[PDB]
Design a protein around this nucleic acid. Sequence first.
RNA 1: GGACCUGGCGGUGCUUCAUAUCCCUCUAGAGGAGCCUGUUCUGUAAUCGAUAAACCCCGAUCAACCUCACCACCUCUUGCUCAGCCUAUAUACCGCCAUCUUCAGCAAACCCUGAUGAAGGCUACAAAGUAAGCGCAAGUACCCACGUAAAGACGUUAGGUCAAGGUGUAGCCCAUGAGGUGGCAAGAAAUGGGCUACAUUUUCUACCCCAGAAAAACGAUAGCCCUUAUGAAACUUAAGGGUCGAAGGUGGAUUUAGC
Lengths: 338, 196, 559, 295, 132, 101
Amino acid sequence: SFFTKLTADELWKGALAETGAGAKKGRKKKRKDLNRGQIIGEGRYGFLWPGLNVPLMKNGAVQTIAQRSKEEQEKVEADMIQQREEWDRKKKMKVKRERGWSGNSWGGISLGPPDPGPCGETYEDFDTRILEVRNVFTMTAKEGRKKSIRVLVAVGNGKGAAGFSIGKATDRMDAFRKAKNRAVHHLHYIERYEDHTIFHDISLRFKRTHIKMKKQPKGYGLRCHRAIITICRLIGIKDMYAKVSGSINMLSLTQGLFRGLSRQETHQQLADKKGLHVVEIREECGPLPIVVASPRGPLRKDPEPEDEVPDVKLDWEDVKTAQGMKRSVWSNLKRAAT
Amino acid sequence: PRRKALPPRTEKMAVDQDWPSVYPVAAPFKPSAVPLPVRMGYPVKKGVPMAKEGNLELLKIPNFLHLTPVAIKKHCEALKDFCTEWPAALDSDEKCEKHFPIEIDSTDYVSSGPSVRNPRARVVVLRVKLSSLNLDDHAKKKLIKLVGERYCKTTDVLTIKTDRCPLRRQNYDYAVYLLTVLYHESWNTEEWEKSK
Amino acid sequence: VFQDDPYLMPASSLESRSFLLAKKSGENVAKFIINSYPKYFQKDIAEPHIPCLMPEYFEPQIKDISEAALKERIELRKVKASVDMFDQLLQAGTTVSLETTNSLLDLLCYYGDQEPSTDYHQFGVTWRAKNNAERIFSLMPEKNEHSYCTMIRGMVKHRAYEQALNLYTELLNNRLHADVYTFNALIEATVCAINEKFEEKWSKILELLRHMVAQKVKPNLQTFNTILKCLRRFHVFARSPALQVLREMKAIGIEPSLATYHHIIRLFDQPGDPLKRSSFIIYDIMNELMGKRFSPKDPDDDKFFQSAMSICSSLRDLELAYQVHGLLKTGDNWKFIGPDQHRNFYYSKFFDLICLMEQIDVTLKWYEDLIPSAYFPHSQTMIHLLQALDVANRLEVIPKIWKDSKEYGHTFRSDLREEILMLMARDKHPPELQVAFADCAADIKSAYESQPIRQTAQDWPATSLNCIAILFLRAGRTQEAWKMLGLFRKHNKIPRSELLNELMDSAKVSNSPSQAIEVVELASAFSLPICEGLTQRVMSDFAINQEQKEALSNLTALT
Amino acid sequence: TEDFIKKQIEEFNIGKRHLANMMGEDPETFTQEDIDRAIAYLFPSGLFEKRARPVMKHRAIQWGEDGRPFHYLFYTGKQSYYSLMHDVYGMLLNLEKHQIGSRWLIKEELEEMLVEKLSDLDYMQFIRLLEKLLTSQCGAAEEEFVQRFRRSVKQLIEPVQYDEQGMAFSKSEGKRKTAKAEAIVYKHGSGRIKVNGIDYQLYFPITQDREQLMFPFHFVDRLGKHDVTCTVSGGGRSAQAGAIRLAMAKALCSFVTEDEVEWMRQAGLLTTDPRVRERKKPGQEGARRKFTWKK
Amino acid sequence: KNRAARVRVSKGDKPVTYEEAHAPHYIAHRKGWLSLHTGNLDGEDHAAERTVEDVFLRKFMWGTFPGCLADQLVLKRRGNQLEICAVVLRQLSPHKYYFLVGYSETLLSYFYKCPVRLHLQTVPSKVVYKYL
Amino acid sequence: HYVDWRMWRDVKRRKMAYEYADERLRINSLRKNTILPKILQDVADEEIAALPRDSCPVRIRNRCVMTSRPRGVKRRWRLSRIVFRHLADHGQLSGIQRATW
RNA sequence: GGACCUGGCGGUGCUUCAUAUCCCUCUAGAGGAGCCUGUUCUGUAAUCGAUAAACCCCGAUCAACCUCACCACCUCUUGCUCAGCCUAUAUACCGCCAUCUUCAGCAAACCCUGAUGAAGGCUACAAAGUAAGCGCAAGUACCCACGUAAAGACGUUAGGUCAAGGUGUAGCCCAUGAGGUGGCAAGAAAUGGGCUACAUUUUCUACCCCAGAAAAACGAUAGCCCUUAUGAAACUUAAGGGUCGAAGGUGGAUUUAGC
Ligand SMILES: [Mg+2]
Ligand SMILES: [Mg+2]
């Protein structure tokens, strides 16, 4: 019949069964458009209607009704089938994503720049990276076990300004959006020595996570925990060592890393505090003294105490490595460029 | 480049223009033609009624924009030629009954659709006051008795409704013939009429 | 006819014609579907019955070899099947009416063995030497006056002039009498058959008229219309007998129609000066037609107005054009305006003459009344309107006209943009006029950026860029002027000396040295002789600093 | 912004001029009522919700182009309400230093007045402050302020007419259920009541209906002092009796004193009984009787 | 719950026109009938014929203008005249629109034996009354 | 191309009943009277019985004209209750509206 | 294994409550009888679906033939259809709905707190929440502003409908399709609902409310017979008439509805 026909949208809604008893709580087919490759005025009879499917004027004259030959109609059908096959192949194939720390992990995966601000603010210079995606469940009487997604997101412009945030949502993409839009309002500014490394070694203990960061020369690379590698790439640090001990909780790790990096003391601040030239000694430069910092105010003529023995709390791992007693089969392993 | 939609011609319109020229005949509401900033539709919370552009509610209305009072006056000025003056000698209904005792009622039905046929339009009603006929006591009594329920004693009006024939003209002719034969038979006298 | 919607409102004349052609194509496709599948439209629910909404029939259904099938084919004009059935009937020897064979000859001669063009399955002589019409005429058992009449008319229609002469000779042999239309066809065939001079043609036409009088055949408008059409070939000689033919029409009582006057006007439209002779005819024709409603009588009637207005445009007579238009706008006479092309040409010439001669106020009134209500103006018409406005110093509406240009598909017309820019930038104006002109120039620049000629590297006219920069400077939009100074060398277009002078004039008020120096950079780049003097002005009217004057000295050394 | 509003105002003025031209009215005296009538005629819409019908008619922003808000209490988020509270508190301070058929407007009315949204507790606070202002022996300058927030919370009587016979009479009408009655009561009479040309004791054999007819005249102590002619149609015996009673009371109001009119109104003789038959609904036996609930 | 001719709010993202945003109990109150004919009046006949013709016209104009109709059609009947008022998008070229107007008008006029007319109002995009 | 074979059967029945309507009317009028002789009425009875079964107008069933639903069809619109509800709810039917009183 | 977070369900009490509502109280009923009707069972060769509330005068605002999808028998094969299927799956769906709902909550999007942990965000003489939107409300229909309708979100029962129709999946294609003729449908029985009553506030008649009679009769729309209406067909439908005058004598626990 004819009056029993329906629209494409209603038929697709009925066939796909997007809603129902099975889809209500989770107790494969996908929509395909049949109008993308169909042109008005094209039928199996292969008629040419002037002005609808063929140009209204040919050689400057009004065209008349024409019918394509059987071979021409076969050619047109072959072209339509070829176009449909090519579009189906293009839809089936995809531009493969760049995997993060592992193929099935969400960490390290870039999310693109954060959404632009309302008052003419754009964050196209910022890169967004995922650090943890956890499924968190709660016991509610109304719904039994409620499921949500908590996502830890780190953003950074590669020039010191970087931040992190936590996004809770029922949908993963919504959590990503929330976290990455909230992070840019919580941007620490990390001071980098020579725009490539930290100013000094940082030993910190955030909750039950110890982070030991060692300042390293140019070209040493990022020999750090993969999360710390990602965060340092976001900040703009290119050479640093970092060892994580105790609890390796990602949230505590990120919070402690940001706390330590923000609390680090620059050379200029040290020079102003102690009123003395901060002079750099480099082995590659020999005995040449490089004055990297000078006090802003009057210089201090006190020759400072020549401390015979520094009362500094050393770390046993560093001393063991320096003396060679450490023989771990995992240290100094050759790894990909970081 | 893709085609650019022109601004509506309402912008080019003048305040003192001749509106009936814009809409000569009945036509659907056209936002590009109506210069009025009319709005229709139930407003949303903290909202305003939808504008005329794309307003399906305005499109639904059987608008009277082609029948403005100025347009009505011009149309009637044109159509006054076709009319004919009513006779002033019978300005009252009493003179109408004095000169035209027979009234003919016929209904014409107008409805949407491709077919104009309507059976209800075939009915004809003939109304005549018997006091306006030339009758005596015997003829009047016989005619009243013959017509029966077709005559109302209160109004002294005989009403004959004819719909037996398919057509309007046929029913009218039948009504006239029925009145004529009723009159002539009423004036006629028969043998059975004596035994009252 | 067009849908009253801004998207579907036609912009240009080409858009108008294309939209109408598309609508007609849709109607033709629908009718083709209706006739191809009539069984879907045979259900009648219309009361009263509407015959024009029923499917039509073009194919005959009678199959027996008899007069019925032949008549069905003749009335359906199916020439091939009619001829085959007539041959079969002649072979069988069955009866056929003389009128039926006459109708067959009429169909064949009018169509010339051309199958009628259904929905679907110029130069030279369209007639063919071998045809079934001549064969059937030879095999015709009995001939009559109407047979000769229709054969002559069809052969004249198909330019079978020699065959028409043969038919005339056969008519004379049969000693029968033709009618007025046959004599007109004979006159046309005699005139178009040979390239003889005027004397022979006129003598033959007069002899044919006298023969028609002798044959007791009365004249008609077609006779004089064809006489004028034939005499159009010999304008120089025919200028005199045209008035004689017209007076003959008046004396007989055959009132000349619109086509007769059109043919007389065309005959008087000899290549050369029309004031010498057309002045003696056009006013008399207008006086005769003045305040007279007309009816369709002759096929060329619709042309008249067009032709008249054309020569009106030649005479530069605004009053005559007004009289012609009033004749057109009198009663139903507007329906004689003609086809779309004739209407467009007539209105174009009329509005051009109005712009040329009429006062600018009435010119603008006519512009509002006719455009776009009557026709979409051509680019040349808009150029003439711009010229008329410039003459009347009413420059304030120039941007609006440009808007109208954007409304009429003239955005991409380079010549119109050049004219508008030149008119705007030619003279200095009060600040409001200047800023309006700058807005128009910016719109024109955007149009240039959006042109579809971008397929090839756009050849931006140097004059256009100079005028746009001049308008920007005079208004006060200097930044776009500097950017255009850069684009000059980007597009390799030579600047204007007046443009450099206006650059200096605009920069003097704001007292900007570097912007002045940049103009010297540009002029030295294009090595114009003005640069030297330009440099002097830069050294004179501007507080040039040390490095800017160093640049001036370097350009003085470089140029 | 204000630019959009001004553009809309100019567009409305131009459209008003076009509408006046189309209707042939004078563009000067073409007022809002004329606009509404013209729009209703030109676009006849029978949608019951009047807000959905076509209409041609004439919230704002609280800061300028520089970003500075206009009101000094803008950052409260409820600048109108808190400004009103500030003014009321100032008036109370001034009063302290120097020394019914009206009710308080509802929260919706206050929100409409202050074009803001207010909570119930805010409304109660403002009402208590206003009451304190009233009880503080506030002067006229504050009494007008109170009356800004005050909202106001008798039966019309037909006049006496005269007939051809010369009698003085009044006429009224009433209805009850599906019965409508029209009564004519003469100023002077002998207690005669004729319903539809029939004497009441014959048209109303039921004693209850006759008692209902007696009730109005007996209440004002006017039995036998008037003559009544009633025409009643529709309903049953009791509905007709009630309609005639109401019509007679309404007509007799024209002859009793205003005090007696008020007494009759308090006795219910003048209120039209709105109790009419309730429609049967689908899925249930009657107006309220549900079907037998099976188990 | 009533599921008839209603759009259910899910995320406040789905755009709906004025027609779709209103439930059936609003027809007499906020959205007039999409078709206007005298067949459904008192004492008038041929209601079923008009209904069938309206359904066919809707299903025919929906397929003749694929992806072009912005909203549902408006069918008006005046005497034997039939008018289809359609809100259409500006995606298609005007040549195709005019071709379709002529074709549809002629075909409907010959099919229903009535002088059908088609008035198109073009909009840049589907007008959104609200989001659901 | 009707909705179902039941609608096709009903269409056949309607066409056959319209074809044989006059013959049935005449024979039945011969039958439905007490004036003509009883033997003629009996031969008329056997004649009307000899007519094809599907020509009887009682066999005509008023099905919905769009879904062939045999029951719940409003005669004025010739539509089933479900289809009529759909069209009225979408507002495609003139005049018909939700009833509230 | 340590400490927390969110947790709930418990024939577990107390104090307030429910407004035709939980009980009592009010009125009229059902549960007793006949009849009508639906269901279950029995039976038949002889549909299906509905199945506590939320099925049971339900799909049906309706089955003598048709309807009809059932059965028996016979017939047809590119079939009215660019076939068809009332074939399986409502645990694939659209579509239209039930149900709490005689509910007022559902909520995106933000912000803040907990060291930026699973989480939390309440104070009005206010101490971090704001909220678009949806629903309620409002507005509208009917006779008001009341009332009744209408409306009534998100969720709940893998709730009902593949037999309104459409459609996913799977199956039949000389048949699970199509056509014709004929046929069921009863009662051992239980159950739901309805009608009529068991009378004297009644019955019959007149009247439409000032009467006269009846009163062991009251009481069948049932049974039997006949006629009539409709139809081609009445044994099976309806109406009327005649005949018969039966059960029944205000009905248990329980239970329905009404402000
Ligand atoms: Mg992998
Ligand atoms: Mg059985």
